[PDB]
Design a protein around this ligand. Sequence first.
Ligand SMILES: *P(=O)(O)OCC(C)(C)[C@@H](O)C(N)=O
Lengths: 242, 1005, 96, 66, 145, 72, 48
Amino acid sequence: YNPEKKEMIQEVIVEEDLEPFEASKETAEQFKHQHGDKVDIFEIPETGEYSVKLLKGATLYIPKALRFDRLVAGQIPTGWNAKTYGISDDIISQVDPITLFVLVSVVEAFIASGITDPYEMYKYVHVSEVGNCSGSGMGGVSALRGMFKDRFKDEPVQNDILQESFINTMSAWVNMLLISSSGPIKTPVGACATSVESVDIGVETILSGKARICIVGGYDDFQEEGSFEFGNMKATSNTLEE
Amino acid sequence: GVATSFSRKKARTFDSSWNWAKQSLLSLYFEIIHGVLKNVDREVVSEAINIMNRSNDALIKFMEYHISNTDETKGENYQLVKTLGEQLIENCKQVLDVDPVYKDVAKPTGPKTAIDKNGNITYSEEPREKVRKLSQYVQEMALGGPITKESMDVEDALDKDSTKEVASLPNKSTISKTVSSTIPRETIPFLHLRKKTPAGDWKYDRQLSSLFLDGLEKAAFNGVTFKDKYVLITGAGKGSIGAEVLQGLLQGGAKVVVTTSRFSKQVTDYYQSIYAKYGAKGSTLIVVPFNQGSKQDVEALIEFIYDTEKNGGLGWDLDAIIPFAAIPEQGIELEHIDSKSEFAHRIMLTNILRMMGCVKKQKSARGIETRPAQVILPMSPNHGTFGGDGMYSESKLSLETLFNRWHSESWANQLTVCGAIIGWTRGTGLMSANNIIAEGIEKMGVRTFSQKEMAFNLLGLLTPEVVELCQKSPVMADLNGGLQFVPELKEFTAKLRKELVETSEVRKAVSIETALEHKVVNGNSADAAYAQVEIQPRANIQLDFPELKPYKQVKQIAPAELEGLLDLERVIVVTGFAEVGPWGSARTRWEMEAFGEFSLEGCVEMAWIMGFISYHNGNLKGRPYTGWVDSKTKEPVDDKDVKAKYETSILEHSGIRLIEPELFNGYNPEKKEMIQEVIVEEDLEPFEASKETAEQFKHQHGDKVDIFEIPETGEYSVKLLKGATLYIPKALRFDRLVAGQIPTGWNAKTYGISDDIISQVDPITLFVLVSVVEAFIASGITDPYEMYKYVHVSEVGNCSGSGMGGVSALRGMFKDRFKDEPVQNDILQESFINTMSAWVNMLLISSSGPIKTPVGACATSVESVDIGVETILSGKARICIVGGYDDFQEEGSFEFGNMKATSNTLEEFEHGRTPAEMSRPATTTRNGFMEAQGAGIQIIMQADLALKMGVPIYGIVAMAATATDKIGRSVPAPGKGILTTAREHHSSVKYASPNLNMKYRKRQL
Amino acid sequence: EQGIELEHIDSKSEFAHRIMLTNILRMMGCVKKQKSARGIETRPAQVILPMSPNHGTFGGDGMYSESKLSLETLFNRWHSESWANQLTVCGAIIGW
Amino acid sequence: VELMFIRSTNSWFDVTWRTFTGDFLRRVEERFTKSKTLSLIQSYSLLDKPDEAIEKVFNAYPAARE
Amino acid sequence: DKNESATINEMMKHLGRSEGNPVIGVFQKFLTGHPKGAAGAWMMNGALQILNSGIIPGNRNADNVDKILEQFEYVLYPSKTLKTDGVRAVSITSFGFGQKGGQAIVVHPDYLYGAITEDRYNEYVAKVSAREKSAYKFFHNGMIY
Amino acid sequence: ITVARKYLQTRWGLPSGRQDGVLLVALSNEPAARLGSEADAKAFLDSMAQKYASIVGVDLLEEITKDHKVLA
Amino acid sequence: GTTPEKPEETPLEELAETFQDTFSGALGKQSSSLLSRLISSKMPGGFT
Ligand SMILES: *P(=O)(O)OCC(C)(C)[C@@H](O)C(N)=O
């Protein structure tokens, strides 16, 4: 993502027929289904591959590039890598970037509490009395790119991309990889207040007598599309004025 | 006609009698308690038989608890069910580990034709004299009559005490003198077997015929088993001898294949309901679609039956075929024999022969030479004796060759023929053209039959004596009831029919003329102060607040110690609720969920929701009108006429159904728009852009585009060069075509949300705004601000949430921006899960109380409730909105398809499922969930506050909990962490906890 | 049709059944229509039907006996329909 | 009845006003019946003892009292 | 639908449910489909309607109940509507993506009124009877306009 | 917008000061989707040229040599 | 097309032999869809 060169696509009508190109059978029928009259597809009888003639009145999408005025952000230091904390590539190449920030923050928080092995809690407290009451404002935002933009472009996207999008999954992965509690999970969405709401939900979970211990916090990622949408709301500092 | 109907993937197995026994017993229990069935009704016996026929240990543990915990003090009908029950338990235990039985116990009816004063012909089947049991029916059949002349009293308690007739259901009654010895010499019974004489005719054999009737006497007392009998039966649709046979088979735990011509939801349900009332222990019912007129379906059907469960067949081996399929041909004389009759001749003969041919091939194949299949052929006694039957008689008479061919060919060890000469069978208990004259024939000294009697007769040809007999020689059973001996039957029948049509028609004309004479002589003062006023009901739609009982009745329910014991500040209570979803409101969905049909009030709300009807108060074409009015034609509609006018349309456009594109921004899952990146192999034809837009192309493409000012216009030319990238649209065809969508025409306008709001907020927010209003109305809170009479501004909370949120606004900010479509600048604020609650506060409540929005995927509502409760007990909020809400869009539909969470709709259609029957929980064949949309909302309060405000109280939220599962590597796998709500310690469990006993707890207080 | 037992009834036997029965009926149907057309009610046509005495008594005849035995319905239908003044049936039980 | 029917003369002031209250009682029956019935007020003659003819309608549709 | 049946059956076993007293399942999603986040709110609306009628609606698409589910003695799977002498309490169980179980018990509201005095109850009854009329006034006005 | 200005100069006879105002009434009264044919695009501007008329108060051979030069 | 009864516990050495017995040599549906998408997405302009 280079905010000086923000990739869009403009719809244009083919005023005059395109030079044919070869597709598979499958992919050509996909062009024919979309375009109807406005495409011609013909088996090349030697190969089996099809020719695809985009006719006058067909629609195309031609890429363009906006220059965007928000060039600056508070980013994690360059070279930060979940590997250096000792998260496996199985996990890294599966889970959304924001989940990696959370997994590192939960470990590094048990270390601050002198709790090197999460299971030590279950000497004192029943399995059903550790809760997670943390949450995000937007969640797995990179996984939403996957399931709205990248699919649309028929890029390769993992089939389970939708489960990584959900705000309640960063907490799923913390339970699935560290805690193994069967205690409460009450995930808040509080936009920019989600952390203090988290704490509130957390406390009232402990006084209710549902949980003796509770992870509590918040987590949020910066991507291209939120950067842009906060710019259109005029919430963020315009960097060129700055 | 000859089109293939049969697939294996459309075959529906019904086998879960273990579950249907418990449902049938509870359905009988409450029917007796609500006095729908009395101790005189025969249905309580009929129903008892079907619970004995399914008797197992689980069903006795079940009946013991339900019958040993009824308080007989509570009413006369509670005494009845406990007396009946105790007996039905004693029976069920006697018959545990004993084979189940076809035993029909219905009151055998006769026909009755009546013509009134005004010449209207009425038909009614009418309880006979001296035949009030099937025992009696076999005696009557044995004695014959005066015309059949060729030239015992077991007291019961039917129709006075069925609880005593229940007691006598296992008691296997043995008789000395059989009804073989009742048959008076020089008289032919009405039911009789025949024997082939060396000349080659078939005559009444007395001794065969005795054996048959003796089996039939015992069937009537003790009942018949069909355990381990496997049957193919065709033409067994609703209202046929076919279907009253099917009941009897299943009732004796037969395993039956049943073929339908017309396979549909409506039929698959008929069959579900027969199996779930009749299918005894071990019974099974496979329903396959089938054309008997198709050669290739007959070949297929027997291949599917015989084939191994491994190659996708059944693994059965037929012990009886009953090929009773027919197409009716009427008014087809010999000059009119055409394609219909030629096609019927194939269903009713050549393909019967091809189906018996087939089972011989599949039985031989596997060297099966000792397990033959009784073919029961439906014969007529009347070949060409009526006429206008087309090739019907030519079809039936040619089946009489199988009696000879059995001795003359190589198939006698695979097949056995048992030809039934089925006589006059009164179609239904309504007016069949044939029925009205039944009474008239019977006066000759002859018998006609209900279908239950003709079923009984043919199930007697599957008893183990006439099965043992079929295996020696063929069996001709004459179940014609003496109609051989009425002579010139065609003219005799047509006399009787003439004399009813005449006697009616005459008496209808002489009636009409004597009421026009009177009207002329005495005018319109004798016939006008006479014609009464009728009152068509209107639709008083009710809020369905709960019935409050007088205090004296309420103290009976709760323990006396409870008064003063609970702190009601700390009891949570649901005060109202509502929803928007596929069946409209909480009101209309309840009418569908519970009853399956809409009331007059349900039709009107549905019609109003979907904007089919609108109110009008003023002038309609001059006239002054106040009522409903078709929303499109503005033509006045009465409430009685809403069902006729609009039901069909409401049911087509409500529920789970094919995704309607106009609802989802033209999303057509058959045509799902993607874009493929291609490289321009050769330079494009220039196009004109603005200056701005051309610099945008140049910035992206660099070398690979050329942009040149056109010096006249100022506009630029844009030449896309070789090596430039393009995006060409394509279209996936997607396999998820069905979803549970809000009914078509639902519009926030009809609730009175302004266009300012509609054209601003995400669709899901509109479902929520309507659900919160319609929930305050359920709580009798018409003005939200009324709350602030009782409670501070800071003590109303919103603890509702979504799994994904404003999903249409994510399309805006990921897809539509990318395509430089116009998208509102504030689109990002609508995406957020915490904004539906923002808009509820901003447009209705104006609380400054808690807001704690959960994300719980498919559990967000129960988490919402939990967060809600704990917010009220913390003492942060006295009132709390609580619920959940979620929208269906293109992109989630797709992503749930890639996870293989949702039902694939094209597989569903292979199995011949309609969209209605595609969500089927707890089912053998369940294959993924049905995505839906909408919102639910509840209002919860302190009970203290609820009683002060006098809001209705719909229930008490006693408990609410959330639990994670364990270590795993699968986010969508469900688990067991919610078991921790039942966590207790049972080490020290010898003596009672005094803390559980409320009396103790009150003494301490 | 010979050596065609009931397991072997196929297209030949289904086609024979049309020659030896349904199209016989269609040919008598036809003459009734052409005779009625012209109001001929006093010049009937004797149909001589070749009957067998042996229906299924040998076997391996395919649908031969099912064909022949179904012609025995015309004896009843003559009294029960509207074609007795155009056609008269005369069934011959032709022996060996 | 209080405002249009006159106790002293034991009659309706105007017959168009009797019509008015009959038409109204018919609308109660339309609103509160479940099922097409024949009307309890056949002739508006019956209204001429109007307390008896009110009880008759609000006995058979007692929801209307509430 | 096996995992849920299995947990209900193990709660009921551990709390000494009477053998022969199975809870009756209701499967309202047969009719509405699964509205993921709204799922449990519709189940709850449905449960309060069951509570105040004692009508248990049947899964009308339960053709054939999985043989695997007969091992669960403590659950019944009905295919028709059962009109009962009353329902005192209803469980509502929701399983989510991301290890997100939930249970709620809803107790019949006539159990509340045993805890209060005859004067207080009679006062409340009046107050509600008034509200319900007002609410009906409002409903039908807002519906037609 | 070259052809949309050139259609308002030949059909209606509007110069480049009024052609601006006709395109500003065509922006406030923008169509919902892509106009299909060139005949729809003209029918549209004919409507917006008679709606400019209302607001301001205004009341109302060699395409073969082209088709060769295209080929060349 | 072929799938043994329990492939998920069967090693890829022993599966490869159960397919090869009934395998013609051709690329089938799934691996002709992935060579088309390698060439479409990861090869330059002209290179089919
Ligand atoms: P894994 O054993 O986690 O199973 C995943 C599926 C999709 C099968 C499961 O979550 C489901 N939807 O039943």
